[PDB]
Design a protein around this ligand. Structure first.
Ligand SMILES: [Mn+2]
Ligand SMILES: [Mn+2]
Lengths: 90, 677, 191
């Protein structure tokens, strides 16, 4: 495991990046347009727009687009965080 | 330690005490490491670099350090050159937003649309590049010889914008369409994308490394042969380098992505081309030996550069083991009749493909290429339409339609090209300041033979000496001077020689007679002397003898290859010497850039240190800074981007400083910049 | 009296048969019949590619005995070669502008066409030295007209796709901006 994507935002995304960083993992963050000024976006080693054109909450729920990013980024893992997709089976 | 706080010299230095804590001391370390790395304190230097090293160290992490551990560990004081890209960019943006860009009126920044991305219809094809890589240079020559169509080289990334926008085309604009070229126009023989003025101008004026340009394009255009113009003796420079340098340049260039080396010499003097040709061969690459065209073969009164001259030279060049013969018509003097006779007779004379290069200054470029394609020319040089015409190359899109139903077609995906030309149409608008103004066909070039660059630079020189009003007489003198010196091949840098001389003569009110009479009591321009000392090599048919003595005087004339006389050069000596001057270990390409253009390479490094990778800015930004309330995103890596809003521009204080108020990534940022007026 | 045929389409494009080579020949006959002194071919949009120019001037010369006066525009970049093709097919007269007011959507250069045919079978009848001198005056004078200049002009082959003459293109770019569609001019050309 070299790299991790947090399928979330804000405090908990930053929480995880920290944990990652301490375990020598590279980080990847995802962000809606509406959230473009969120701290968590810039606290990661690299960050990628998602949900383009959608409503902002829908974007953090766009399962496919997240994984698209997870893959084009090179991520070995995904941390879901809490709320959003973290409890979602699909 | 807060945003805006003036750190004074009076009190101690402490900004903030950071503790970490954890069950396992190993994890207390992990957290400290994260935090130190997490901190973003801008405005003043801090000791963080030092602390990071110290917690990295195994003596510390073991819990065993002593009081002398630090003073006895020299490793702790090697600090990574810190890259603050946010900061340096904002410095640049501020500099330009207030003092404007150098050598262009400080206008206000237009709103520009996204330039048009092309709708392409792709077709998979093997490409000369593919062949070269898989089967070598001779295999490509075979591929060319077995091609029916006239094959095209795209001069859009080099000679086109050199001819039209003073070489100011920028990588950022290039990389936005590079891929579309590679996939949309596989039919191409090569893309001319390096050499010529691009090498110094990229460093000197655009503050981007030509090497960087090459690297970044080479990844984007994996199936397109990359071609460069290359001066036989001097590669991309104007000093007199020894042979080991030239070989070295070539090794590196070859390695870094260049496939096709058009090698020429300003006086078509074979000895300057010989080593370089071999060198290119030796690196497994294609070598175009080139003849420069001057005069008019169908003009019996200019017999010096008659049809025989070219045939004989072509033989000699075939003999060097060049893969391809190139005819570089610098000034667009090849009329279409002559093009048909010349390409015809050269094809009779030698078996290597002929690559023709002209300029559409006279209005006769397309018809000249047409003639030449009837006479069997293998390859021709074209620019996309939007950067074509006038003193550029003839239109790629036009030459397709010109030969459409003819015996020989042009090999190119014209639909795809027309789509790509939309992007170039748009992008060229960013370069308005460098545009040369109203351009129409001009046949006077047949009278004076100045290449497009020489004409630009002599209009400059004339205005800066207040003779801009008598430029008509200056052009006439250029013609007289050329004849006075025995009728010579005028390309860079022999073109400047005639240039400088014709200015000097007008400026000081002397005719041809006046030179032959009172030459000894006159100091002729440096260039003119170097030429006649043989520092440029040996002109066709040698110099006029009386005039040589007069111009040279006491000085030491050579008559062999100036590279033999070149100050011997050591790569280790210079590499070490440079490492000290820039403060890191330079790659082989930096070394060689330094050898080629020493001053310019160092100035480029100051600019880099002060301003960063300006390369990454959109061109309107790069040239005009920002507008109040404007927002921009600058991509720096994949997934890292600087969002930059500008919110206010302060009035200046008494020291002539202003404070610009940006939001970079959701942080206020105050930036002080010297207003210079 | 020059009776004139206006050129449109592409005679060498079999899918545009309406204005094929026959169309022109037949019209030329009819016009010869009216007692016109001269046949004129007015290529308003600069659509005459040079192969087509040779076939067309050729077949018309085979059809009628009155001199042919050809007029094209250098918008596509192919005006001079088109005139060259046409002069090989025997065209009697061609329309040119002095170099300083030539090119782009103007006519092909008078000075350039001389040099284009210089050592060819058929020369252009003009005093080119004198023309080059005169072109200086026009060079200078055009500067007075800077406000009306149309901006950076380069070759454009899209004219073959849409067939707008230079004036129509200018006036439709106007009309489009004044109805705030200037941004969608690409769609307008398609329509
Ligand atoms: Mn050139
Ligand atoms: Mn008209």
């Amino acid at each position: 495991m070299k790299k991790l994507l947090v399928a979330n935002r804000g405090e908990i995304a930053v929480r995880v990046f920290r944990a990652c960083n301490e375990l020598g993992l590279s980080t990847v963050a995802v962000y809606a347009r509406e959230d473009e000024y969120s701290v968590h976006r810039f606290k990661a080693d690299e960050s990628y727009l998602i949900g383009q054109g959608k409503k902002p909450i829908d974007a953090y729920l766009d399962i496919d687009d997240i994984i698209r990013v997870a893959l084009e980024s090179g991520a070995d893992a995904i941390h879901p965080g809490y709320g959003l997709l973290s409890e979602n089976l699909e | 330690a807060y945003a805006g706080y003036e750190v004074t010299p009076y009190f101690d230095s402490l900004l903030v005490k950071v503790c970490t804590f954890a069950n396992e001391f190993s994890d207390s370390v992990r957290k400290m490491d994260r935090v130190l790395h997490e901190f973003r304190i801008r405005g003043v230097k801090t000791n963080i670099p030092f602390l990071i090293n110290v917690i990295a160290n195994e003596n510390f992490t073991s819990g065993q350090a002593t009081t002398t551990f630090i003073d006895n560990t020299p490793s702790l004081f090697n600090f990574p050159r810190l890259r603050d890209r946010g900061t340096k960019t904002l410095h640049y943006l501020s500099m330009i937003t207030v003092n404007g860009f150098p050598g262009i009126e400080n206008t206000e920044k237009r709103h520009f649309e996204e330039p048009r991305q092309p709708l392409l219809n792709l077709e998979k094809k093997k490409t000369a590049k593919n062949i070269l890589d898989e089967q070598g240079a001779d295999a490509v020559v075979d591929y060319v010889k077995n091609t029916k169509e006239v094959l095209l080289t795209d001069t859009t990334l080099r000679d086109a914008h050199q001819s039209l926008l003073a070489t100011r085309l920028r990588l950022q604009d290039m990389k936005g369409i590079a891929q579309a070229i590679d996939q949309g126009l596989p039919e191409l023989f090569s893309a001319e994308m390096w050499g010529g003025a691009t090498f110094d101008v990229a460093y000197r004026f655009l503050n981007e490394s030509p090497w960087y340009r090459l690297r970044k394009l080479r990844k984007l255009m994996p199936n397109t042969m990359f071609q460069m113009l290359f001066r036989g003796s001097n590669a991309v420079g104007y000093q007199n380098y020894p042979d080991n340098v030239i070989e070295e340049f070539i090794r590196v260039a070859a390695h870094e992505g260049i496939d096709v080396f058009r090698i020429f010499d300003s006086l078509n003097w074979l000895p300057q081309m010989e080593k370089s040709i071999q060198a290119v061969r030796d690196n497994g690459k294609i070598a175009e030996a080139t003849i420069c065209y001057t005069g008019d073969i169908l003009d019996p009164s200019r017999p010096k550069y008659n049809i025989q001259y070219y045939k004989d030279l072509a033989k000699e060049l075939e003999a060097t083991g060049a893969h391809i013969l190139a005819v570089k018509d610098m000034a667009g003097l090849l009329k279409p009749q002559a093009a048909y006779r010349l390409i015809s007779e050269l094809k009779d004379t030698v078996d290597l493909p002929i690559h023709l290069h002209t300029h559409d200054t006279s209005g006769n470029g397309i018809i000249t290429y047409s003639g030449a394609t009837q006479a069997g020319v293998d390859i021709i040089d074209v620019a996309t339409a939007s950067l074509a015409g006038g003193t550029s190359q003839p239109s790629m899109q036009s030459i397709y339609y010109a030969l459409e139903h003819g015996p020989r077609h042009a090999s190119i995906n014209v639909k795809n090209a027309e789509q790509i030309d939309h992007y170039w149409e748009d992008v060229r608008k960013y370069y308005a300041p460098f545009e040369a103004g109203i351009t129409s066909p001009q046949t006077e070039v047949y009278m004076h033979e100045m290449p497009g660059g020489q004409y630009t630079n002599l209009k400059s020189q004339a205005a800066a000496v207040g003779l801009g009003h008598r430029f008509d007489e200056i052009k006439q003198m250029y013609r007289k001077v050329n004849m006075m010196f025995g009728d010579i091949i005028k390309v860079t840098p022999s073109s400047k020689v005639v240039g400088d001389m014709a200015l000097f003569m007008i400026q000081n009110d002397l005719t041809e007679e006046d030179v032959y009479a009172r030459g000894n009591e006159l100091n002729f321009p440096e260039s003119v002397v170097s030429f006649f000392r043989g520092d440029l090599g040996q002109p066709v048919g040698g110099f006029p003898e009386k005039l040589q003595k007069i111009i040279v005087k006491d000085k030491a004339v050579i008559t062999d290859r100036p590279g033999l006389h070149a100050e011997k050069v050591d790569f280790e000596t210079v590499k070490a010497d440079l490492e000290q001057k820039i403060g890191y270990e330079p790659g082989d390409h930096e070394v060689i850039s330094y050898i080629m253009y020493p001053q310019v390479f160092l100035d480029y490094q100051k600019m880099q240190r002060e301003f960063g990778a300006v390369t990454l800015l959109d061109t309107p930004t790069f040239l005009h800074g920002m507008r109040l309330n404007e927002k921009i995103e600058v991509q720096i890596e994949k997934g890292k981007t600087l969002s930059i809003r500008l919110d206010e521009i302060g009035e200046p204080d008494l020291a002539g400083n202003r404070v610009l108020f940006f939001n970079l990534n959701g942080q206020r940022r105050e930036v002080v910049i010297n207003d210079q007026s």
